Amino acid sequence: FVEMVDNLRGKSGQGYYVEMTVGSPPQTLNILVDTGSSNFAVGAAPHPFLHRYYQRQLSSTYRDLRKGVYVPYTQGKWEGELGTDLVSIPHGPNVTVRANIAAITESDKFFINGSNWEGILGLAYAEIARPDDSLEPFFDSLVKQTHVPNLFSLQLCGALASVGGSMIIGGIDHSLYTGSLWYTPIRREWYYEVIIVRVEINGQDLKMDCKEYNYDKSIVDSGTTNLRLPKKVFEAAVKSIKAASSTEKFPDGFWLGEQLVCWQAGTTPWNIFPVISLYLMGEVTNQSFRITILPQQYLRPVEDVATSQDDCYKFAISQSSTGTVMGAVIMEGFYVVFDRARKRIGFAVSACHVHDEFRTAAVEGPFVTLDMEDCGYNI
Numbered sequence: 112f113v114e115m116v117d118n119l120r121g122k123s124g125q126g127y128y129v130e131m132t133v134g135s136p137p138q139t140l141n142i143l144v145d146t147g148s149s150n151f152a153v154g155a156a157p158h159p160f161l162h163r164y165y166q167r168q169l170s171s172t173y174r175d176l177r178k179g180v181y182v183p184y185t186q187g188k189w190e191g192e193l194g195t196d197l198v199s200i201p202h203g204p205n206v207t208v209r210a211n212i213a214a215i216t217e218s219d220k221f222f223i224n225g226s227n228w229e230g231i232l233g234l235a236y237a238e239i240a241r242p243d244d245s246l247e248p249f250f251d252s253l254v255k256q257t258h259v260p261n262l263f264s265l266q267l268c269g270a271l272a273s274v275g276g277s278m279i280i281g282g283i284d285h286s287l288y289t290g291s292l293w294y295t296p297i298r299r300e301w302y303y304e305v306i307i308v309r310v311e312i313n314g315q316d317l318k319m320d321c322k323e324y325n326y327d328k329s330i331v332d333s334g335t336t337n338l339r340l341p342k343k344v345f346e347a348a349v350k351s352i353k354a355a356s357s358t359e360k361f362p363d364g365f366w367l368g369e370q371l372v373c374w375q376a377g378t379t380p381w382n383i384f385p386v387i388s389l390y391l392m393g394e395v396t397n398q399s400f401r402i403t404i405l406p407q408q409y410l411r412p413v414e415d416v417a418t419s420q421d422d423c424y425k426f427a428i429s430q431s432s433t434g435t436v437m438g439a440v441i442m443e444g445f446y447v448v449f450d451r452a453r454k455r456i457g458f459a460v461s462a463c464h465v466h467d468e469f470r471t472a473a474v475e476g477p478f479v480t481l482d483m484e485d486c487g488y489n490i
C-alpha cells in the first residue's frame with residue numbers, strides 16, 4: 112500500500128484530509144476524513160472560503176435523488192441536495208464506485224475560513240447517516256462494489272504548521288507502527304463505539320465506576336480534535352492532572368479551555384505533566400490492554416496567537432455531554448485500524464507520534480480486568 116502512504120494533509124487543528132475525485136470527468140476535491148460521521152458531503156456552491164466545489168452540471172455520471180437533507184450540529188449546520196456519482200481516491204485503491212453525495216448548498220460554521228478542504232467523508236456506519244440509514248455510506252458502497260477489503264487504517268501525524276498522515280484503504284501498512292496491534296471490540300456499528308474499562312493518570316487509577324467512562328458512549332473520532340470526557344470523569348482527571356503538575360500553578364481557565372498558557376520558546380515543561388492511560392476492553396474474556404498518551408498529545412500548540420511572541424498551548428482535554436470522544440489527541444499517538452470485517456479497532460504505537468527522550472506513547476497488554484461488560488452504558 113506504498114501508494115497510499117502520506118496521502119493525508121492538513122493544518123494544525125483544521126483536520127486531516129484526503130484527495131478525492133467526483134464526477135465524470137473527475138473533479139478533484141480535498142475531503143476531511145471523519146470517523147465520527149457517516150455522510151459524504153461536499154461543497155457544491157461558491158462559498159467564499161472554498162478553494163473549489165462540486166459542479167454537478169459538468170458531470171455526465173451525476174444522478175439526482177430528488178431529495179434534500181438538513182444537517183444541524185451542536186454549533187453549525189449544512190443543507191444539501193442528495194444524488195449519486197462516480198467517486199475515486201487517487202492515492203487509494205485503483206477503483207471507482209458510485210456513491211451517495213450530498214451537494215452542500217447552504218451552511219453555517221461548517222467550512223473553516225483558511226482551510227484547504229471542501230467536503231467531509233463520514234466513515235462511520237449507516238445508523239447515523241442523515242437523513243436515515245437507507246443512505247448508504249461511502250465505505251459501504253466501496254466494499255460492496257469492489258474487492259477492497261472491509262477495513263481501513265489511519266495514521267494521523269500531528270505537529271499554522273502542516274500535519275500529515277496516511278489512510279490505508281483496504282489494509283494495513285506495518286511500517287506505520289511499532290510493536291503489536293491490540294484490538295478492542297466495536298460494541299455497536301453506528302459510531303465506532305468502544306468500551307473504556309479503566310483510566311490512569313501517571314499510573315494512578317481514577318477509581319471511578321467504569322460506567323462513568325462510557326456515559327453514554329465512547330467513540331473513536333478522527334473528526335474531533337480533543338479528548339472529550341464525560342463531565343464527572345473530566346473533573347476527576349483534571350484534579351489528578353493538577354496534582355501531578357502542582358510544581359507549577361496555572362489559572363483555572365487554562366484547564367477549562369478558556370485561556371491559553373504560553374512558555375518561552377523551547378521551555379515547555381513536558382516532564383511536569385502526567386501521562387494518561389485508557390484501558391480498553393480486549394478481545395478475550397477478562398482481558399484488556401492500555402493505550403498511553405503524553406502531554407505532547409493533549410497540550411496542543413496554538414500558532415496563530417498574534418498578541419504573543421511565545422509558544423502558546425491549549426489544554427485539549429475537555430468535558431462532554433455525549434460521552435467520551437477519542438479524537439486527534441488520542442489518534443495522533445497511535446496507528447488505528449478500523450477492522451470493520453471483524454468488528455474491532457486496533458491500536459499500535461504510531462511511528463510518527465510526537466514524544467521526547469524520556470517518554471513515548473505506548474500500547475501494552477495483556478492485563479486482567481474483571482466485569483468489563485458492566486462498563487458499557489445501557490438506557
Ligand SMILES: COc1cnc(C(=O)Nc2ccc(F)c([C@@]3(C)N=C(N)O[C@@H]4C[C@@H]43)c2)cn1
Pocket residue numbers: 123124125126127143145146147148184187221231332333334335336439
Ligand atoms: C485535529 O483534528 C481535527 C479533527 N477534526 C476537525 C474538524 O474540523 N472536524 C469537523 C468539522 C466539521 C464537522 F461538521 C465535523 C463533524 C461532522 N464531525 C465530527 N466528528 O464531529 C462533529 C460532528 C461534527 C467535524 C479539526 N481538527
